[PDB]
């Protein structure tokens, strides 16, 4: 845990709501499961460490940092209320993977094989019941 990094995103929070959702379940059960085991996933299954990785600017671009290990310590610990908050989640460590990396990148191409496989998962999140 170097200083230079910086905290992780909240995954614990007593102050904020909580509800389980089938929806919610969906996303754990079979969307993460998915994802995290795709060939692609290691780089995205911890924060980005900019200090080991030598990429010091990292944290100066991406200011709303995302990454699979957050998304699944938030949906095995009910840190969300909703679907939305947890595809938000999704969206945003691919988004940050595409803003700070070249389109040609292995890593842009690895983001893009687990975001294509995403979208399927999601559009069959079910109706929420
Ligand atoms: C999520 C993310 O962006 N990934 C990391 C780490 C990483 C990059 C390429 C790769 O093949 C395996 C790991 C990264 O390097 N970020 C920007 C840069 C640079 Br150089």
Known sequence: ??????????????NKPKRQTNQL????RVVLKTLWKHQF????????????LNLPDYYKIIKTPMDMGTIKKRLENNYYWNAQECIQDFNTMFTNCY????????IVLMA???????LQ????????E
């Not at 845990?1 to 007593?14: F, L």
């Not at 996933?41 to 460490?49: E, G, K, N, R």
């Not at 998962?121 to 929420?128: D, H, Q, S």
């Open 25 to 28: 379940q969906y996303l754990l």
């Open 41 to 52: 996933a290691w780089p995205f299954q911890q924060p980005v460490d900019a200090v080991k």
């Open 1 to 14: 845990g170097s200083h230079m990094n910086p905290p992780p995103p909240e995954t614990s929070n007593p």
């Open 121 to 128: 998962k999601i559009n069959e999140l079910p109706t929420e």
């Open 112 to 118: 893009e094989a687990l975001e294509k496989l995403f």
């Open 99 to 106: 803003i700070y990396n070249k389109p040609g990148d292995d």
